[PDB]
Design an enzyme around this catalytic site. Structure first.
Site, PDB file in Angstrom:
ATOM      1  N   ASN B 188      17.634 -21.578 -24.265  1.00 56.99           N
ATOM      2  CA  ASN B 188      16.719 -22.586 -23.906  1.00 56.99           C
ATOM      3  C   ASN B 188      15.977 -23.090 -25.018  1.00 56.99           C
ATOM      4  O   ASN B 188      15.142 -23.704 -25.352  1.00 56.99           O
ATOM      5  CB  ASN B 188      15.636 -22.495 -22.774  1.00 56.99           C
ATOM      6  N   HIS B 190      14.593 -21.428 -27.699  1.00 60.93           N
ATOM      7  CA  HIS B 190      13.084 -20.710 -27.838  1.00 60.93           C
ATOM      8  C   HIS B 190      13.527 -19.651 -28.768  1.00 60.93           C
ATOM      9  O   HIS B 190      14.543 -18.750 -28.414  1.00 60.93           O
ATOM     10  CB  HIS B 190      12.485 -20.363 -26.640  1.00 60.93           C
ATOM     11  N   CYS B 225       6.798 -18.837 -32.059  1.00 65.64           N
ATOM     12  CA  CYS B 225       7.269 -19.248 -33.315  1.00 65.64           C
ATOM     13  C   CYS B 225       8.324 -20.477 -33.215  1.00 65.64           C
ATOM     14  O   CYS B 225       9.157 -20.436 -32.582  1.00 65.64           O
ATOM     15  CB  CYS B 225       7.909 -18.076 -34.296  1.00 65.64           C
TER      16      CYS B 225
END
Ligand SMILES: O=C(CCCc1ccccc1)N1CCOCC1
Ligand SMILES: O=C(CCCc1ccccc1)N1CCOCC1
EC number: 3.1.2.14
Lengths: 265, 266
Positions: B188, B190, B225
């Site tokens: 996804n 991330h 992050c």
């Protein structure tokens, strides 16, 4: 995994993991590269390597990758099973070649193919040398005698010369440094990390609208643990072709060069 | 892999790969973390979660599971070529959130070689806000968890439930300019939770890694992050060797992670 009936090739099945896939939920080219790497190590263990022959260990010689070429038609989806058949072949005094064939464990169709060229190098002095006749006979018994090429074709992409990217590059990714996950068991940077570093300069929009079809990569020098790398890319071209260059951030010493070919989704 | 007889836990066997091991030829703590991650995804698929992990109410509420803390204790790292069996299970922690536990075993001897525990919380995938587990969103997953308590770390006053302090400047050791590449991202887009483990360990001097084996690691997750973010990894010896860690964005010094590691001499 296991060696085939003749003992001249090795097969292994792999179930694709959740963390191994990209945004499209299909394995990345680095997962595929890592899978090729594992089936080659398993084929070397199964044939008696504790990977050095009796004459390679006596002369402090090791195998090093000079070129890697990968062509994917379909990337296996998360949860799918991919079968990989790998084999080796003597290229006389030049070096050795390792080929791979990727297949869908359900349909049996070829979903990818890869070829690599390995050369001799003194582990200590870092100097390349030709394959001696004594070393050749020790590994020839594990290779098919007749030619068996994954990329047989008259003018295939795997044997084409790669030019050097000229400054200024169109796209760039600066300050790339390896972490401990990028190292192998002998503390050297894993050959797959350089693939990931080459692809970092490709803009995200190209990755989002295209699937990577072909990748040729020439290895010129290794990146030390304490080295910083710059990744450069320029479009050379329905299909998108690129020219790549990896160089140390400081002196601009060339580490890698290669090409990628992409098709629209 | 497969669910056990009761259907309240999941097991899976893993053969250790050549590229998954470190200098001593045993799997790294990141390979182990990745293995824990895969057996948890497989346990969620086998119990009916689509590959598009959320319940029927989480979909109509835009709620997702996020890791708040990870704790791993390893006694023996599986060697290259060995087979490691992992048993995983989930447990409701009322309206605080959910807990996922793991037990690592040697597929040959059957002895426990490691154990891990994680705390997951509810979060709106759009606003990144934190929410309590609602009662309706509990009864939908409670049927997949053992009713009686089953803890991988049962002992009262144990390492997995200890509060972690914030590292004070100046740090003893540091690794700056750490940025994720596409291999560090998940499906996804991330940053995968294992990357933060690797970034914490980057500030540990190589001589400590060469003379010690990592025994315990507790890691608190405070912020994600972004793909375009730069991270600084800081470490100070607090002591066996104990360390205190801090991950913060290179610019503003915004805290993303904090944790501890415990190491034994070889
Ligand atoms: O592929 C190679 C080089 C040739 C080794 C070989 C194996 C089996 C039959 C014949 C030759 N390697 C395996 C793993 O990478 C490092 C060495
Ligand atoms: O474990 C979880 C959340 C709970 C999902 C669950 C699975 C099986 C039984 C009970 C509950 N995660 C791991 C997989 O990715 C998403 C988060």
């Amino acid at each position: 995994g296991s060696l085939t009936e003749d003992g001249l090739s090795y097969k292994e099945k792999f179930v694709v993991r959740s963390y191994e896939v990209g945004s499209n939920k299909t394995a990345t080219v680095e997962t595929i590269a890592n899978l090729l790497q594992e089936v080659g190590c398993n084929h070397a263990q199964s044939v008696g390597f504790s990977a050095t022959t009796t004459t390679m260990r006596k002369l402090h010689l090791i195998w090093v990758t000079a070129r890697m070429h990968i062509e994917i038609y379909k990337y296996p989806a998360w949860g799918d099973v991919v079968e990989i058949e790998t084999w080796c072949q003597s290229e006389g005094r030049i070096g050795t070649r390792r080929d791979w064939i990727l297949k869908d464990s359900v349909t049996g169709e070829v979903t990818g193919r890869a070829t690599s060229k390995w050369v001799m190098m003194n582990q200590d002095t870092r100097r390349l040398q030709k394959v001696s006749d004594d070393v050749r006979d020790e590994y020839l018994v594990f290779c098919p005698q007749e030619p068996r090429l994954a990329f047989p074709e008259e003018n295939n992409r795997s044997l084409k010369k790669i030019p050097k990217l000229e400054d200024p590059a169109q796209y760039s990714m600066i300050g790339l440094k390896p972490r401990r996950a990028d190292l192998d068991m002998n503390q050297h940077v894993n050959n797959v990390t350089y693939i990931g570093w080459v692809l970092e300069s490709i803009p995200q929009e190209i990755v989002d609208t295209h699937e990577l079809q072909v990748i040729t990569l020439d290895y010129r020098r290794e990146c030390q643990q304490d080295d910083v790398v710059d990744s450069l890319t320029t479009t050379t071209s329905n299909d998108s072709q690129f020219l790549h260059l990896l160089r140390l951030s400081g002196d601009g010493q060339e580490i890698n060069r290669g090409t990628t070919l992409w098709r629209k989704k």
